[PDB]
Design a protein around this nucleic acid. Structure first.
Lengths: 203, 260, 108, 133
RNA sequence: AAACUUUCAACAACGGAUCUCUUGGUUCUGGCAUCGAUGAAGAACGCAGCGAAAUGCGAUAAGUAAUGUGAAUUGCAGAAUGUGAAUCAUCGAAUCUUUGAACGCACAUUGCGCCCGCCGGUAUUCCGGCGGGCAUGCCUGUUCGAGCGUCAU
RNA sequence: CGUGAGCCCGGGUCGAACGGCCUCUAGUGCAGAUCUUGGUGGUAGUAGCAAAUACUUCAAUGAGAACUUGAAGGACCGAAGUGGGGAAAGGUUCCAUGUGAACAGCGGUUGGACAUGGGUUAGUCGAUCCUAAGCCAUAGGGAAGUUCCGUUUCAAAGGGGC
RNA sequence: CCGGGACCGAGGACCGCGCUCUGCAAGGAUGCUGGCGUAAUGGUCACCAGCGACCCGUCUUGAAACACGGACCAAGGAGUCAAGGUUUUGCGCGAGUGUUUGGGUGUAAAACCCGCACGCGUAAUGAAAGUGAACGUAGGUGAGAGCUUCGGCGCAUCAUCGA
RNA sequence: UUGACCUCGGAUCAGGUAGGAGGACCCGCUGAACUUAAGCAUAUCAAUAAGCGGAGGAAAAGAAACCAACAGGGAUUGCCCUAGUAACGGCGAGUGAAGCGGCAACAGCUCAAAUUUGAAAGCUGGCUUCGGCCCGCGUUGUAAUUUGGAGAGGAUGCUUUGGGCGAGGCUCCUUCUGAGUUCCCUGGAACGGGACGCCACAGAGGGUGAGAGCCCCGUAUAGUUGGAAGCCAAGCCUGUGUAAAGCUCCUUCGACGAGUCGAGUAGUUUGGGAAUGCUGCUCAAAAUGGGAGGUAAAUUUCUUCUAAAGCUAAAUACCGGCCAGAGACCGAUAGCGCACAAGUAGAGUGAUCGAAAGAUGAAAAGCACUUUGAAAAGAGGGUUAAAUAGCACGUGAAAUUGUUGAAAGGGAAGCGCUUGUGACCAGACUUGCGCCCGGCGGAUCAUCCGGUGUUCUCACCGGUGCACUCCGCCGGGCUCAGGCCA
């Protein structure tokens, strides 16, 4: 299985510029940090659960916070990108748990946020006062507001009196019964409607 | 270059009675016309199997084997016979491994080259520095044309702790020929075993010798190796009472008499 | 290296069905036997459980956190009650857990 | 060891620059040290040589000969000194080219521009000495 | 015996290998984004006191201005040098022949024009020369128009 | 010295770098390929320098004269010329001085060679103007397009006078 | 048993077998003497003499012959690199292993550090749905190195019968 | 008759714009064959080369008519993995993605579909006294408002804003930077060897008559003169609400792109030859409608988005251009064809083809003068450290050639074994060791004492030795071992 039957030597890509490109990326990161200081170098990202049955055990960072999350946390959608929060209008909150977790995340960010006034001489009521603008600050939101607990805890201890009884008939039998019922959904419905029609005909 | 030997138009003159069937440069009016081309046996032709940049230049080494080799080089640096066997002049060194006080190097104590040289002569690395100074020679070959003009021996390596000793000692030791410096947390096997030969002469600071255990405890996935031999003194094992008391009597000597 | 090659020495002498659009994430379900089940417990706590210093507690093991979806039944278990949460289970594995005194809980 | 990325340690590039330098660069290249008296007088170690200077030759076969510079022939990187000549076959005198680093300047042809050069060099040397002191 | 042919040796020839060198290639890496109708890339013809080429330049022609440095250039001859040498560096001001997308029509021609001014030759009329103009497609506006296409009177 | 590939030394020439040992690395070892490039022999002072009738005397120049010049002879082309001029093509070969080598398959003082200078003058001779066979624009139509057809068209294509 | 001749002298304290036992011919040469002390011995080169001796490479078939290349000399001149397998060798760790896509750091293309994922391995079988590895000190029998308290226990591996 | 619209024209009208070059990378179009399949029309090479059009510093793509089927992710691009996998494939050679996941980098928006209708509120151009005024475009629609994330209408009570300085910092060219030419030897010349120093945040590199940290340029770090143009920025002055703007709730309303989607067919393309895209031809939509949900169809559901209009940085590419730094690369038949007046000289009608060719010496000091020659040159004599470096020029191999010396040769030479002759040579040897006497010159003889080190019992150092003891020398004598051939 060797795929060398085309003119492969015309488009061989070597990577002797790997350390140089790393140095270039680090210089760009320094320049971006210096331009954005004292703001963090990145935006705040939500916690989302990966799709498919393979990766739904693990959580990761998403694109941006939903409009429902912003409304529940009390941040307007026009102010949110101007204070370091990513906004995603495509994502929806189908369940309460992810919504609550992201609202708590936004509330923690708003509690730890320092907001400087637009004009120095005229601070407003929503702005951080000068005696509170001085504190230790973070520059990496991906570190300070990362995914703390990506997977569920794999080990927990319970007392022997609290051991569950379990599914009646056995877990293996429960799985077999669930599979069999799923495969026999429509046959039983056809039989039931045929029996109902026969009962209506010969009542 | 991938086009070398091939920027020419040449066609073979066919089977005949006079000339070999090499492709020959077409045209006329010049010396090149009618001359052989494209062959590796031809003047002004392409070489056999031209060199390519996608040759495998770099070697991937397991991090465990790198750390193992670094540990072995550090262990060989504390063996005074190997220091002499690697060519270092250590006859006046008071103790191996040589540990100097961090008060003599911390801050700007040895930020000047004169102060660093004085410290080396005081602690006894002076003969090794002078060996490096006297060993300078002109390189034999095309390395002189290619930017590698001189060769000299390797001198001492000062290992320091950047947290407590600072980094101005690097500037202070930089101009002394053959003298190298290294942080305790970034030790280099290319420096610890130059040329693949064990026994580099190292001057340690007290701060570095204090953080060495923390450095080798912080390496995730690596532990200090267990040796397959517990006692390396083969004479002590062989002439121990436990082994000698159970041996069969000798069946001969080192020299055998010729019977016939 | 070129100097070790033999050429330098020889110098001078020369079925079934087709599945369109297969997604492997559908069929992802790694399996673990019960003889490796106690290896998922952290080492010190496992030693305490096996020695017998925890007679009033039972360990709860989530296989999905360790990356396993099915608990298979190769080997034997010690007589210690263990709660096991898994997406799939084999009949022999569930039976051996029940003999050990624990329970197999089904999750998704 | 050089640290600055704009500095090249290439022998080929250095030799090309030396042997194809323009005339203003060759002036600075063609520099000679001052005598001890002039060094203590002006606090200057070396200056570019020019016609009208008085030099003493301290290297070569014409060592300890002293004379005035008659020509600074920058194309062969040499200078010509009074009475430092040789005889041809015919008996005529032809000057012998001396490199400026083989001589020491004993008396300077001095004017406003040379005074300005000496003043800048001296002020810079004292400024560096005071800053590093 | 010599000569001749061959062999061996020293010296001398022929030839340019070998060694040593390298203002050149080759490959990698880093940085940058800037050609042209305000006439480019390319071509031709010229220009130095004494040049054929390479280099530089355009009738202001191995160059002018300006800024900086600060005493050369050099093969010969001859001169200039504190507004100041230089085959110097820098470069923001200019000059920039005939061409070329090449644009009055042509061009295998140093051919033939048209409009408005100017200069010289006796010149309102004639003859030469010079200056500014006269290509095509398309856009916006202006102005002059055509059509029983069509409206009001 | 080594079985050997080779290694080491002495003598001579020479002028700026180079070697031993252990690892690392490869564009790493030649008698052949009618091999590539360059150089050099025997053949060999050989084959040959024999179409176009043909040369001789004296003097001068010069180191040197069959093939330079003057004179004196003898011949040839024989007007479809070995004559006098042009078109194409070449480009200074034209003229005058001077000349080592190289070139003129012998020589050479001579030369279309080499070096330095000079030489081409038009209202009337040609070009320039006209059209021929033919080619290229414009209107317009094709073609993905570079571009192709089209040369009187299915064009509001312009002159003059009061 | 007694003569005559040729070639050879390996080893390097003693040890052993022995005998004809003050010693020896018994597990390998010593003793005495002469000339010379240098080109005398020895070596290299040129040549003569006796004897010996086809011109190399290639191709072919079984082989020769045929055929092809080779005037001479110098320099150049042909199993290489990449990817992917496979067997063997060395090395690290080991039910785990792989830092180097990336991030951190740096004396800056080096070296040092970091971890989420992911790859391979840890489970197979079936077209698939799916199911998924202990009756027993992880079984019995015959061998089997090694150990043994000398009764036996029995590694690897092989053969066989079972689960 | 006079004028207005609409459409179409003219002008060397006023003001603009395009072409060509470059094309490494980028966006499209068009499009092979050698090759690999035994051959070969499927296929492969290859949706490649060549050909054509169009851009930029990047381009392109890009804010879902997406992926999915999950506890759901959430514009684009690229790397790693997915994965040589799903899949496609004569007679099989072969071909071959995507979602998820980790990372680099992240940034969102503009129109059409509404009546401003209590007031085209919009804009090009001309002239200006720079205040504006005109000629027009436009109602077949120029501004404000709205873009599905919504929004419009209400209700509600709070929040929001415009200008001007600006300390200081950053980017770029400029002035300046440490230390021996100390002494001796060799040498033509020290940059070599030796001695004594000094500098070093500089011992990188180059030059200078041979290997130079300190002779010269440079090199290192802090700065330090002078100038220009930008950017960022701690703070500080002021106007305050005519107007715009956000949030909350809601009866209601809530326009959303057509020869387009879709279907058939043909060609091409794809892993998508049952599930791909594109184009041509034919037919041709709808309003909870439409697209998709990788097996054709009907019925009932479900889940996701919202096409047929548009813009937009970064991470990504780069055999072209400009600037710079490097290499376990090549060292003049090598490395680019070109280290040189090389894309030159030369050749070809032309398209095009296309070389050879580096090195005197530190410095020309490139040979004065005499003499022989017509001259070229020769000989003396000079320069140089060297002419055994003479502009044929560093070194100067082999083939091949001349002279000198030796030898052999009656139709081949060359080669192997072994002598011989001639010529030319490497070794070896020259005496050493040990005793016995005699003569000298000295006390680093044995023992003891003290100190020191060690291997803890062995040594060294200072005193002591007084010459029958030790150590060298010089004469003899003796023994032993010594070279080559017998």
């Amino acid at each position: 299985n060797n795929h060398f039957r085309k003119h492969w030597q015309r488009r061989v890509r070597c990577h002797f510029d790997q350390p140089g490109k790393k140095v270039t990326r680090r210089l760009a990161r320094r320049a971006k940090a210096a331009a954005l200081a004292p703001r963090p170098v990145d935006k705040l990202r939500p916690i989302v659960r990966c799709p498919t049955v393979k990766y739904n055990r693990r959580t990761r960072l998403g694109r941006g916070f939903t409009l429902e999350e912003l409304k529940a946390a009390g941040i307007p959608r026009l102010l949110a990108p101007t204070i370091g929060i990513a906004v995603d209008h495509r994502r929806k909150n189908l369940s309460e748990e992810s919504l609550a977790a992201n609202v708590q995340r936004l509330k923690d960010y708003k509690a730890r946020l320092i907001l400087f006034p637009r004009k120095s001489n005229k601070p407003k009521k929503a702005d951080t006062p000068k005696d509170q603008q001085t504190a230790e600050t973070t520059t990496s939101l991906r570190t300070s507001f990362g995914v703390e607990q990506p997977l569920a805890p794999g080990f927990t201890e319970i007392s022997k009196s609290e051991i569950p009884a379990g599914i009646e008939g056995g877990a293996y039998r429960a799985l077999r019964k669930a599979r069999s019922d799923a495969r026999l959904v429509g046959v039983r419905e056809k039989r039931a409607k045929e029996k109902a029609e026969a009962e209506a005909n010969k009542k | 270059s991938e086009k070398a030997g091939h920027q020419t138009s040449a066609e073979s003159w066919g089977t005949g009675r006079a000339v070999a069937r090499i492709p020959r440069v077409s045209g006329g009016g010049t010396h090149r016309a009618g001359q052989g081309a494209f062959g590796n046996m031809c003047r002004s032709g392409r070489m056999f199997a031209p060199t390519k940049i996608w040759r495998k230049w770099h070697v991937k080494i397991n991090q465990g084997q790198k750390r193992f080799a670094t540990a072995s080089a550090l262990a060989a640096s504390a063996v005074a016979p190997l220091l002499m066997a690697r060519g270092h002049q250590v006859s006046t060194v008071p103790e191996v491994p040589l540990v100097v006080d961090s008060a003599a190097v911390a801050g700007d104590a040895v930020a000047k080259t004169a102060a660093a040289y004085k410290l080396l002569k005081a602690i006894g690395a002076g003969p090794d520095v002078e060996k490096v100074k006297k060993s300078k020679k002109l390189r034999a070959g095309k390395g002189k044309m290619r930017g590698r003009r001189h060769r000299q021996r390797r001198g001492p390596l000062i290992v320091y702790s950047p947290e407590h000793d600072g980094k101005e000692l690097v500037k202070g030791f930089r101009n002394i020929p053959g003298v190298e410096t290294c942080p305790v947390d970034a030790l280099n096997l290319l420096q610890l075993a130059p040329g693949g030969h064990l026994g580099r002469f190292i001057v340690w600071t007290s701060a570095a010798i204090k953080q060495l255990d923390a450095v080798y405890e912080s390496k995730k996935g690596f532990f200090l190796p267990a040796n397959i031999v517990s006692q390396a003194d083969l004479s002590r094992l062989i002439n121990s009472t436990e082994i000698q008391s159970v041996l069969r009597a000798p069946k001969g000597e080192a020299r055998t008499k010729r019977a016939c | 290296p070129t100097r070790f090659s033999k050429t330098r020495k020889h110098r001078g002498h020369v079925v079934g069905m087709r599945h369109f659009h297969l997604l492997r994430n559908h069929y992802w379900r790694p399996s673990i036997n019960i003889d490796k089940l106690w290896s998922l417990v952290p080492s010190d706590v496992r030693e305490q459980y096996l020695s017998g210093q925890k007679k009033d507690t039972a360990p709860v093991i989530d296989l999905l956190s360790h990356g396993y979806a099915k608990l298979l039944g190769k080997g034997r278990l010690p007589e210690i009650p263990v709660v096991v949460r898994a997406r799939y289970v084999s009949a022999e594995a569930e039976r051996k857990v029940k003999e050990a005194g624990g329970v197999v809980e089904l999750v998704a | 060891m050089k640290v600055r990325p704009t500095v090249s340690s290439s022998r080929r590039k250095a030799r090309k620059a030396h042997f194809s330098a323009p005339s203003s660069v060759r002036r600075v290249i063609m520099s000679a040290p001052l005598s001890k008296e002039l060094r203590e007088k002006y606090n200057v170690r070396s200056i570019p040589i020019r016609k009208g200077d008085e030099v003493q030759i301290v290297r070569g076969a014409h060592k300890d000969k002293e004379g005035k510079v008659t020509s600074v022939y920058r194309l062969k990187y040499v200078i010509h000194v009074e009475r430092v000549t040789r005889e041809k076959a015919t008996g005529q005198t032809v000057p012998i080219g001396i490199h400026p680093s083989n001589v020491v300047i004993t008396k300077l042809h001095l004017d406003k521009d040379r005074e300005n050069i000496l003043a800048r060099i001296k002020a810079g040397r004292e400024q560096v000495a005071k800053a590093k002191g």
